[PDB]
Chain A
Amino acid sequence: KAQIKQALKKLYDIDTVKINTLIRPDGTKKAFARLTPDVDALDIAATKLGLV
């Protein structure tokens, strides 16, 4: 989780309050990273991630 939050901060300048991780049945890890209330995850996904 610390490596994930460090990678997010280094790549997209994203700060998080908490991260939950689970290993999927297909074998890959999935992370739910909750952002700080100051920044908008919809805005981040629209601009940096292109998730519209």
Chain B
Amino acid sequence: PSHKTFRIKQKLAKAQKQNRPIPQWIRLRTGNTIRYNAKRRHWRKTRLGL
């Protein structure tokens, strides 16, 4: 809701900053095994569990 606490909003801020695809320079590194964000989150799909 709009009425939210500071701790909850701070966790949502961290989640929103983490919600991004990986940079394209990650894939060009030598010995790189990461191809996508396996921990990517969407609002419709999976809940944060707060």
Q: Please say whether the chains A and B touch (CB closer than 8 A).
A: yes
CB of B12 within 8 Å of the partner chain: yes
B contacts with A, residue count (CB < 8 A) = 7
CB of B9 within 8 Å of the partner chain: yes
Number of cross-chain contacts by CB at 8 Å = 12
Interface of A is mostly: loop
Interface residues of B (CB under 8 A from A): 9-10, 12-14, 16-17
- In Å, the complex CA distance between A22 and B47 comes to 26
- In Å, the complex CA distance between A11 and B36 comes to 44
A contacts with B, residue count (CB < 8 A) = 5
CB of A26 within 8 Å of the partner chain: yes
User: For B17, what are the chain A residues with a Cβ–Cβ distance below 8 Å?
Assistant: 26-27
User: For B9, what are the chain A residues with a Cβ–Cβ distance below 8 Å?
Assistant: 23
